Design a protein around this ligand. Structure first.
Ligand code: HEM
Ligand code: HEM
Lengths: 110, 110
C-alpha cells in the first residue's frame, strides 16, 4: 500500500507567513487522528509577491485523509480559520487555498 | 533551528511516473550524507496530459542541501540521470526539472 500526501497551498499577504505558521504550534487534535503520520508547514523561499505557506500532511492512505476532513477535531481546529474573502474574514491574511493530492511512491527517513 | 525542504518538480511523459519512481528504490549513498533527514517521491494525482513526479528532500539546513549538491555521492547517484532535452537523453521520459525551496516553519511526526 502507498502512503498519501495532501497539500494545502495558502496564498497569503506579503509578510504574513510567520504569524500564520505560528498558528500551527498549538496542537488541536491531529495527534489523535487515525492514519495520520506527519505534517510539514512550509514557507516558500524567494517569493516576490504574496507569501506562500503550504500544509503538507502525510497519511497511511487517502481514506485516512478523507475521514480526517469529516472529524470533530478538524472542525474544531479550523473554527477560527477564515479566508480574507469570508464575510468575517477581512483581518485574515489568507487570500486563497488550493488542494493538491499525491501518491507517495517512495519514502526514506535516515 | 528550522529545517529546509527542496523540491525537484519533474514533468514527465504521460504514463512514465511509476517507472521513474521505481528508480529510487535502491539507495546510492544518501544515508551517508550530513544533514539529510528524509525524502518523499510523489506522483501528482490530476488530469494533466503529462505526469508529475516530485523529489522532496528534507534537510537540517539549506547549507547541508547545497553541500550534497556539490558531493561525489550526488554526482555518482545521478550518473545515468538525463532529461529528454539532453544530447543523450533520448530514453528519458523526464521532460524538465524545476527546483523550489522552502523553510520548514513547523513539523510534527507522530
Ligand atoms: C484538505 C483540507 C485541510 C487539511 C487536511 C488541513 C490540515 C491541517 C492540520 C493537520 C492542522 C493542524 C491541526 C491540529 O493541530 O489539530 C491545520 C491547522 C490549520 N489550518 Fe488546515 N487543513 C485543511 C484546510 C485548511 C484551509 C482551507 C485553511 C485556510 C483557509 C487552513 C488553514 C489552517 C491554519 C491557519 C491552521 C493553524 C491552526 C489555527 O489557525 O487554528 N486549513 N490544518
Ligand atoms: C536539487 C537537486 C537534486 C536533489 C537534492 C536530488 C536528490 C536525490 C536523492 C536524495 C536521490 C536518492 C539518491 C540515493 O539513493 O542516494 C536521488 C535520486 C534520483 N534522482 Fe535526484 N536530486 C536532484 C536532482 C535531480 C534531477 C534534476 C533529476 C532528473 C532530471 C533527478 C532524478 C533522480 C532519479 C531518476 C533518481 C533515482 C536514481 C537513479 O535514477 O539513478 N534528480 N536524487
Amino acid at each position: 500500500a502507498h502512503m498519501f500526501m495532501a497539500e494545502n497551498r495558502l496564498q497569503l499577504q506579503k509578510g504574513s507567513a510567520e504569524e500564520t505558521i505560528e498558528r500551527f504550534y498549538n496542537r488541536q487534535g491531529i495527534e489523535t487522528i487515525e492514519g495520520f503520520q506527519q505534517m510539514f508547514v512550509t514557507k516558500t523561499l524567494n517569493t516576490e509577491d504574496t507569501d506562500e505557506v503550504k500544509i503538507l500532511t502525510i497519511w497511511e492512505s487517502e481514506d485516512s485523509f478523507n475521514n480526517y476532513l469529516n472529524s470533530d477535531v478538524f472542525k474544531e481546529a479550523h473554527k477560527n480559520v477564515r479566508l480574507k474573502s469570508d464575510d468575517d474574514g477581512q483581518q485574515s491574511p489568507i487570500l486563497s487555498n488550493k488542494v493538491f493530492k499525491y501518491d507517495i511512491g517512495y519514502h526514506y527517513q535516515k
